[PDB]
Amino acid sequence: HHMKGFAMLSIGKVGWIEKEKPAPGPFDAIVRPLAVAPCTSDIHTVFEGAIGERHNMILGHEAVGEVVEVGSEVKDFKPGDRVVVSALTPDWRTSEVQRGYHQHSGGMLAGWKFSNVKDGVFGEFFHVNDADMNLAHLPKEIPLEAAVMIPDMMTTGFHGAELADIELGATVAVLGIGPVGLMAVAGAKLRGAGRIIAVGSRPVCVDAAKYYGATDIVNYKDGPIESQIMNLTEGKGVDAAIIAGGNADIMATAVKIVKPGGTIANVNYFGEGEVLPVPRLEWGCGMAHKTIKGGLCPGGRLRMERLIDLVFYKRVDPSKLVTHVFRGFDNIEKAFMLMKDKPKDLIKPVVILA
Amino acid sequence: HHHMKGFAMLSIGKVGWIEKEKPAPGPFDAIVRPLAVAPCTSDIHTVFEGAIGERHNMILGHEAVGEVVEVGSEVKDFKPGDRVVVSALTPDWRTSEVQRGYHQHSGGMLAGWKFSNVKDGVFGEFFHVNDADMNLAHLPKEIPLEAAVMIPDMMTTGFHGAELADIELGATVAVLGIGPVGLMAVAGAKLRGAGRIIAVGSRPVCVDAAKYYGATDIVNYKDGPIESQIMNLTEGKGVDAAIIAGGNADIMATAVKIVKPGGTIANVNYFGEGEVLPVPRLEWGCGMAHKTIKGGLCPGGRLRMERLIDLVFYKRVDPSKLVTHVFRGFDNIEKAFMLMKDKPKDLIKPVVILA
Amino acid sequence: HMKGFAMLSIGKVGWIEKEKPAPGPFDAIVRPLAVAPCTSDIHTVFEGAIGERHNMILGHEAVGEVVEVGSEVKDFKPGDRVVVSALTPDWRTSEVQRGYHQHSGGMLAGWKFSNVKDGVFGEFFHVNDADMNLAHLPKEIPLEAAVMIPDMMTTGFHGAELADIELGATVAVLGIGPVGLMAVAGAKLRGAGRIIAVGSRPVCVDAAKYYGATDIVNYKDGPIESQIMNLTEGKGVDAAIIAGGNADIMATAVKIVKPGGTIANVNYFGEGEVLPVPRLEWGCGMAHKTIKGGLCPGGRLRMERLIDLVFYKRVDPSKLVTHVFRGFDNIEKAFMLMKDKPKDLIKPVVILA
Amino acid sequence: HMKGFAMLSIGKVGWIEKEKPAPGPFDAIVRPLAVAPCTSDIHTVFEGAIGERHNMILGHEAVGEVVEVGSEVKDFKPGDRVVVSALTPDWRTSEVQRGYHQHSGGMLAGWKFSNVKDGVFGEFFHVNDADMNLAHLPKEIPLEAAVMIPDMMTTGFHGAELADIELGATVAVLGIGPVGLMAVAGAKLRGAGRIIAVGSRPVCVDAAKYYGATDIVNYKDGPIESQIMNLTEGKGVDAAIIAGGNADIMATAVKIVKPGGTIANVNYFGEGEVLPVPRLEWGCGMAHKTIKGGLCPGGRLRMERLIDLVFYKRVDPSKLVTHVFRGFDNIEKAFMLMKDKPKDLIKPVVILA
Ligand SMILES: NC(=O)c1ccc[n+]([C@@H]2O[C@H](COP(=O)([O-])OP(=O)(O)OC[C@H]3O[C@@H](n4cnc5c(N)ncnc54)[C@H](OP(=O)(O)O)[C@@H]3O)[C@@H](O)[C@H]2O)c1
Ligand SMILES: [Zn+2]
Ligand SMILES: [Zn+2]
Ligand SMILES: [Zn+2]
Ligand SMILES: [Zn+2]
Secondary structure, three states, X not given: OEEEEEEEEEOOEEEEEEEEOOOOOOOOEEEEEEEEEOOHHHHHHHOOOOOOXXXXXXXXXXXXXXXXXXXXXXXXXXXXXXXXXXXXXXXXXXHXXXXXXXXXXXXXXXXXXXXXXXXXXXXXXXXXXXXXXXXXXXOOOOOHHHHXXXXXXXXXXXXHHHHOOOOOOOOEEEEOOOHHHHHHHHHHHOOOOOOEEEEOOOHHHHHHHHHOOOOEEEOOOOOXXXXXXXHHOOOOOEEEEEEOOOOOOHHHHHHHHEEEEEEEEEOOOOOOOOEEEEEOOOOHHHOEOOEEEEEXXXXXXXXXXXXXXXXXXXXXXXXXXXXXXXXXXXXXXXHHHHHHHOOOXXXXXXXXXX | OOEEEEEEEEEOXXXXXXXXXXXXXXXXXXXXXXXXXXXXHHHHHHHHHOOOOOOOOEEOOOEEEEEEEXXXXXXXXXXXXXXXXXXOOOOOOOOHHHHHOOHHHOOOOOOOOOEOOOEOOOOEOOEEEOOHHHHEEEOOOOOOHHHHOOHHHHHHHHHHHHXXXXXXXXXXXXXXXXXXXXXXXXHHHHHOOOOOEEEXXXXXXXXXXXXXXXXXXXXXXXXXXXXXXXXXXXXXXOEEEEEEOOOOOOHHHHHHHHEEEEEEEEEOOOOOOOOEEEEEOOOOHHHOEOOEEEEEOOOOOHHHHHHHHHHHHOOOOOHHHXXXXXXXXXXXXHHHHHHHHHOOOOOOEEEEEOO | OEEEEEEEEOOEEEEEEEOOOOOOOOOEEEEEEEEEOOHHHHHXXXXXXXXXXOOEEOOOEEEEEEEEEOOOOOOOOOOOEEEEOOOOOOOOOHHXXXXXXXXXXXXOOOOOEOOOEOOOOEOOEXXXXXXXXXXXXXXXXXXXXXXXXXXXXXXXXXXXXXXXXOOOOOEEEEOOOHHHHHHHHHXXXXXXXXXXXXOOOHHHHHHHHHHOOOEEEOHHHOOHHHHHHHXXXXXXXXXXXXXXXXXXXXXXXHHHEEXXXXXXXXXXXXXXXXXXXXXXXXXXXXXXXEEEEEOOOOOHHHHHHHHHHHHOXXXXXXXXXXXXXXXXXXXXXXXXXXXXXXXXXXXXEEEOO | OEEEEEEEEOOEEEEEEEOOOOOOOOOEEXXXXXXXXXXXXXXXXXXXXXXXXXXXXXXXXXXXXXEEEOOOOOOOOOOOEEEEOOEOOOOOOHHHHHOOHHHOOOOOOOEOEOOOXXXXXXXXXXXXOHHHHEEEOOOOOOHHHHOOHHHHHHHHHHHHHHOOOOOOOOEEEEOOOHHHHHHHHHHHHOOOOOEEEEOXXXXXXXXXXXXXXXXXXXXXXXXXXXXXXXXXXXXXXXXXXXXXXXXXXXXXXXXHEEEEEEEEEOXXXXXXXXXXXXXXXXXXXXXXXXXXXXXOOOOHHHXXXXXXXXXXXXXXXXXXXXXXXXXXXXXXXXHHXXXXXXXXXXXXXXXXX
8 A cells, every 4th residue: 555755846846645555575674764854965866856756755854763573584573663774775795895894885975865865764764774784773871862863963963073084182173063063073073082162153053062061162153164163263273073064165274273183074965066175274284194084974883872872871961952842743844944944943853653 | 519419229139228320411401300209110110120120329210290490501491490201211412213103112022111210210309311302302381290100100101001902992901910010002993092991900909090081881800710701701702902001911911812803002111020921822812813912111202202292282181090098298209109019909009299 | 435534532543434515505516726724623533622512524724726606606706716714704794893803703712623523634625705815816826835824824823913022122932832933923023023922843943033033042951930031031921822732821921011911822721621821920910910811813814915025035834834745645644744743844735736 | 613605594594603513322424525405405495395494404315424422322433334214204104114214203204414404514413313314335336326215215215115116117207317217227227118207308318218118299390198198009108207397297197107006106206286186087076096105115124126237236326416516505507507407407416525
């Protein structure tokens, strides 16, 4: 039979459609959602034709669910189990896994199937490929609002911290304090950073950035970002800069503010432009040892399990990211439009299913 | 005027106060007078176990915050009157080992360790710091003295255990031994993003500080073998890393038994007895379990101290909880030293505050 | 249904009969074109270094021809000439997501052939996950050099990988049997400048020089530690790779590596309860002498990269083969060469083709 | 008391007479036994690369004989024949402790010769921190090879070091000037399997093959991205080392490496506002294509490690030396060659011994 889902129809057009219910392969699971959350990624897919032009493709890639059914080879999950579903759900049997980059298993960024090559999570059911490798059990002591921050927001933000090569006591700059940037701040704290400098203006974000460990807040007003951060560091710069937002020009701010031998760690999706500019002089004319990394978030069962431990054992509380809680399935359209309209008091919305 | 009073080891087994010539600096050195000092168990091994051999009239101690008295003509960043954290390690910084990336072993194995070894320690009215510009860090006024004197050694050693452990975001970590060094390995594990931290120790004062610094489980090596309790705690999985910060040589076999394949054993504890540290063949995968074993003298130098000052300054770790005894008075050095020798059940770390 | 050479009991070997393997939907059945015996099967048979087994066909080093594939195999077809990895792991585990496929499902569990499944010393053998655990063999590589890729090349190279060799570093290789010889060439592939090889057999000493060793230390001629200290002018070595010896070679390796260097073991220790780490020369725990010890990487990607190193003439493993025999019967003879360890042996190869 | 070849102004060069340099207690005075010119000096002069200078002696690649030492110099005495490192940094700084001596005291401040100091193109020159920035030169290495060590060898090898080359990985080297040629050898030294060298000067193409290049790619036969993509059957390269080209070579490098691979720059980019990163081929910021660009390591240890690589015949840099001149006056001739290299020249050496 069929089922209901909130999809993208054409560029700039969304709505509800009705498709045949998904069925699992023997290694797969069919999940029904318990809490979902929309993303800026869904917006660039609709109002910018980012991943190309789809047609009746259900949106959303951050979900916590209850396993509805599992194929015959699924060993560690059974119907009724409550699970965190990672946003990345890669095919784990490729040479790219053997090379150590599961995010690109099968091609560049091919590990991200939800709302891309597959129907997303904004439905009554969705399909998880390789349940034993892409699902993790949700402890009862973690509320659905916090868990639904793990699949994408926590892992991307913590990945920026990881890529930053943060040594103990190093000063970190986080450029952008949306939900991803906020998690990059907590991840920097989770890496032994001393001083953490957050760049942003939204006061709900600025309050949350301090709560996640920021010691300084640089505003887009009050001066230019480069000069402000160099003044705070007394002309020394930062050891690492985690890019978590902006357009291509932020790449030059980060290269200008990190010291020689430091790291620029980007987790931002650059949606437009042919090139991202690296400033030649502040990159030491090519010889300043300022490493630039840019990475898609890790995913999979073990990645979620480790983030679940950080939430369980009280190392990070991702709930303060949730500024809007809706109840009920039909509120997915509301939360989606909230991510497009983006009021000043919004960080991340969550739809809890009845 | 030309002399100086200090607490010294007279010979193996005997300590006492002596008088000695004041040290003068070289062009790059500084003379520093103690503002606060702390004794270490390393000094107990040296006096009473001869761990480093015979010394006559050597002033002990190697953890000090102090005020600069005199600087050589080439010292650029430190003038008399400056309050400085003194790196416990004071390497010669122009050696091939520094270029190899191991300042701790500049000029020889453990040769960056000079205080109360090849040079008079900090338990005197004055002491010599070689290469002030590289081995001193400026002390913020916002940091109390008793908390700052934890940085030269206790903080940088415990943190080295966590750095060597290769901790990943959310990994499970076991800290073996929770004296002052193990307690700072617990905090360092938390700094590197450990999820579950399993602390191993018996004394209540250390167990309380272990939970303060981030331990989520306590294993008492009296309720049964450590390895059985930890294996049951992790339901057969083991731990991603085991930081060794105390115990006899047998603790190395315990660490190997509790870390999973691919995990790390990071030792920072000093072993003073026994010919061999046992690595069990079976639980080391007969040589192929990928259980890396590290063991390293603590990092020192100015950059090391500054980064740790920053961690205290920005409220990332409060080492003040390590200080169970604070004595005011230069001569309480001796009494604080004997605390380290006797080890009462409520002692973690003592601090002597000078005038 | 089929025959093969097997460990019957601890210390006891011989031929047995088995039901012919059938492949699961992701597996392949392979018949051997060429196999080789290992010292590791010796340690397992005549020492029970991992415990007892019953009716287990032996062997883990084989180049072969696929005879049957499963329903979901995509890149491998019946008739394909393949390099089979000694380690044939289940690639869908938590340990693979942690970066340790060698221990997928448990310590050393990536190692299935002649450990927990019937090996390659048989008319046929089972390969789990063909797409992930097989590599296509180019025509340009002969069988005798190709059957050194599954195990000797990957283990010896892994020792060089664990050693953290810097450009121009001085590296010591302890043991120059087949694994140590590939560790000498691995260190050469990692930019080692000076390479000191330790060993006794003249056939090994000669191949050690061929692969890159600049110096030879005969452990029977005198203490390794004194000889190496003389060669390096008391400075020691930057890294020491262990590819042979008894348990005490661990102390030798710690004593010859300088502070901050690495000890990289790839040797299978089969005897004794403990491996001794000498307390004094390990800096009493603080010398930064890192000790590693790992089972060789396996799988399709690992084999494809080693194939490239042979194809582009970066290493020639064919000099490891000192004995070649033909036919199933001679597997027995080649296995005893590994046990009897005669003085002109490095590695034997049995051609079935 | 000294004659040197110097930058008179922007655009003008010539022999001048300055006062003899005098050693600090830790520095040494050295006279050149053999020198080589660089293309950076061409930028420094004929392009105003580093502002203006007056009477600043040029050059920064020299093998020399120690003439004078300060009272604190322990390991070098007058008359010692030494390799002098191009990067002569202040080893007592914050950046040394952070692990970046190339930037000790500032961004690229480890560079002093023909920058903030009189270069090696003089009867004498000053080396700061002699014990830390000189290495003894064994008699076994000819002067022409040894002078290839201070810059060409250490820069080109650093590109391979930065590349994170795994054993058997496929590496591309963009540009086959002397730095690219050493980058090809460095990749061989890191265990690269297939090495795709990009360039077209016939002296450099023959030189690239000699150092391990398995493929050569000429811009004349098509675009670089398409040829390399076609050579790897669309798979790409595991690492690309940039050793030449305009700013847009950065875009060619991102396009040819697979996701998860590394672009490693060691090329001097002297023109343009930005170095371009092609957004789409960088995975819109998430393709895990790490970009590295680093100045060459310096110091006594780096030089000793590369001396061993030449001493033990791991690389022979002699092939970089296409032209050998004799006599001081010929310095200007050799320097002028770098302004516009003949299509048969890689690197020139002036012998003064
Ligand atoms: N399980 C796996 O998949 C796997 C994979 C690869 C290798 N391995 C293990 O790798 C190890 C090496 O294998 P192999 O075939 O190269 O071994 P091998 O043929 O026995 O060679 C051993 C080497 O060690 C030397 N040696 C022996 N005793 C010594 C001593 N006391 N001091 C110094 N050198 C000494 C030998 O010298 P002589 O010349 O005098 O004999 C020889 O050079 C084995 O333990 C093997 O099981 C395991
Ligand atoms: Zn998203
Ligand atoms: Zn101490
Ligand atoms: Zn084997
Ligand atoms: Zn140059």
